[PDB]
Protein backbone atom coordinates (compact mmCIF):
# COMPACT_ATOMS: atom_id res chain seq x y z
CA UNK A 1 0.00 0.00 0.00
CA UNK A 2 1.29 3.62 -0.82
CA UNK A 3 0.06 6.61 -1.92
CA UNK A 4 -1.13 5.65 -5.48
CA UNK A 5 -2.28 1.86 -3.97
CA UNK A 6 -4.02 3.90 -1.03
CA UNK A 7 -4.29 2.22 2.32
CA UNK A 8 -6.95 0.70 4.03
CA UNK A 9 -10.02 1.97 5.00
CA UNK A 10 -11.81 4.02 1.72
CA UNK A 11 -14.73 6.10 2.98
CA UNK A 12 -17.79 7.00 0.81
CA UNK A 13 -20.65 9.86 0.62
CA UNK A 14 -24.45 10.35 -0.63
CA UNK A 15 -23.11 11.10 -3.65
CA UNK A 16 -20.45 8.36 -5.19
CA UNK A 17 -21.86 5.41 -2.65
CA UNK A 18 -23.38 3.48 -5.97
CA UNK A 19 -19.98 3.82 -8.17
CA UNK A 20 -17.48 2.90 -5.22
CA UNK A 21 -19.80 0.14 -3.02
CA UNK A 22 -22.87 -1.11 -5.82
CA UNK A 23 -20.42 -0.60 -8.91
CA UNK A 24 -17.44 -3.18 -7.34
CA UNK A 25 -17.05 -6.62 -9.29
CA UNK A 26 -15.92 -7.65 -5.34
CA UNK A 27 -17.10 -8.33 -1.96
CA UNK A 28 -17.40 -4.93 -0.49
CA UNK A 29 -17.89 -4.27 3.44
CA UNK A 30 -19.35 -1.61 4.73
CA UNK A 31 -20.06 0.46 8.32
CA UNK A 32 -22.22 2.86 9.33
CA UNK A 33 -21.15 4.25 12.13
CA UNK A 34 -20.17 7.74 13.79
CA UNK A 35 -16.72 8.52 14.85
CA UNK A 36 -17.67 9.20 18.30
CA UNK A 37 -19.70 5.77 19.28
CA UNK A 38 -17.65 3.59 21.59
CA UNK A 39 -18.86 0.12 19.88
CA UNK A 40 -17.63 1.94 16.53
CA UNK A 41 -14.28 2.92 18.10
CA UNK A 42 -13.88 -0.66 19.13
CA UNK A 43 -14.29 -1.86 15.42
CA UNK A 44 -11.96 0.79 14.14
CA UNK A 45 -8.84 -1.74 14.68
CA UNK A 46 -10.66 -4.51 13.31
CA UNK A 47 -11.83 -2.82 10.10
CA UNK A 48 -8.35 -1.06 9.58
CA UNK A 49 -6.95 -4.48 10.07
CA UNK A 50 -8.97 -7.07 8.03
CA UNK A 51 -9.27 -4.23 5.42
CA UNK A 52 -5.24 -4.05 5.56
CA UNK A 53 -4.52 -7.69 5.22
CA UNK A 54 -7.20 -9.01 2.76
CA UNK A 55 -7.35 -6.36 0.20
CA UNK A 56 -6.65 -8.84 -2.53
CA UNK A 57 -10.05 -10.46 -1.52
CA UNK A 58 -12.49 -8.17 0.10
CA UNK A 59 -13.23 -4.22 0.01
CA UNK A 60 -14.03 -2.04 3.16
CA UNK A 61 -15.57 1.14 3.55
CA UNK A 62 -16.89 3.70 6.26
CA UNK A 63 -20.16 5.67 5.94
CA UNK A 64 -20.19 8.71 8.21
CA UNK A 65 -23.94 9.02 9.83
CA UNK A 66 -23.21 12.06 12.09
CA UNK A 67 -22.58 14.18 9.14
CA UNK A 68 -24.07 12.15 6.49
CA UNK A 69 -28.19 11.26 7.07
CA UNK A 70 -28.75 10.52 3.61
CA UNK A 71 -27.10 7.00 2.77
CA UNK A 72 -27.93 6.36 6.47
CA UNK A 73 -31.75 6.34 5.87
CA UNK A 74 -30.82 4.37 2.65
CA UNK A 75 -30.22 1.37 4.62
CA UNK A 76 -32.33 1.67 7.42
CA UNK A 77 -29.84 2.53 10.36
CA UNK A 78 -31.12 2.69 14.24
CA UNK A 79 -28.07 1.85 16.02
CA UNK A 80 -24.50 1.70 15.63
CA UNK A 81 -22.18 0.51 14.20
CA UNK A 82 -24.11 -1.10 11.26
CA UNK A 83 -22.22 -3.55 9.59
CA UNK A 84 -22.97 -4.21 5.95
CA UNK A 85 -21.19 -6.57 3.61
CA UNK A 86 -22.14 -6.66 -0.06
CA UNK A 87 -20.74 -8.72 -3.08
CA UNK A 88 -20.89 -7.58 -6.72
CA UNK A 89 -22.83 -4.61 -5.70
CA UNK A 90 -25.92 -6.71 -3.87
CA UNK A 91 -26.37 -6.65 -0.58
CA UNK A 92 -25.56 -10.63 1.44
CA UNK A 93 -26.17 -9.45 4.91
CA UNK A 94 -26.46 -7.03 8.11
CA UNK A 95 -25.18 -7.16 11.66
CA UNK A 96 -25.56 -4.11 14.62
CA UNK A 97 -22.88 -3.84 17.20
CA UNK A 98 -19.65 -4.53 17.26
CA UNK A 99 -17.40 -7.53 15.68
CA UNK A 100 -13.95 -8.99 16.38
CA UNK A 101 -11.61 -9.96 13.27
CA UNK A 102 -12.67 -13.34 13.47
CA UNK A 103 -16.33 -12.98 13.51
CA UNK A 104 -16.05 -10.36 10.90
CA UNK A 105 -13.61 -12.64 8.73
CA UNK A 106 -16.12 -15.62 9.38
CA UNK A 107 -18.95 -14.03 8.07
CA UNK A 108 -16.68 -13.07 5.07
CA UNK A 109 -15.50 -16.80 4.84
CA UNK A 110 -19.45 -17.57 4.30
CA UNK A 111 -19.51 -15.11 1.01
CA UNK A 112 -15.89 -15.99 -0.74
CA UNK A 113 -13.49 -18.86 -0.29
CA UNK A 114 -11.04 -18.57 2.82
CA UNK A 115 -11.78 -21.43 5.60
CA UNK A 116 -11.19 -24.15 3.58
Do not use: H, Y
Not at 9 to 23: G, M
Not at 47 to 72: F, G, H, Q, W, Y
Not at 90 to 98: D, L, T, Y
Not at 103 to 116: G, I, K
Amino acid sequence: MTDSEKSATIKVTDASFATDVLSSNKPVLVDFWATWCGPCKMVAPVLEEIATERATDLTVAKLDVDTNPETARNFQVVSIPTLILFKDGQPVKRIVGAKGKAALLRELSDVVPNLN
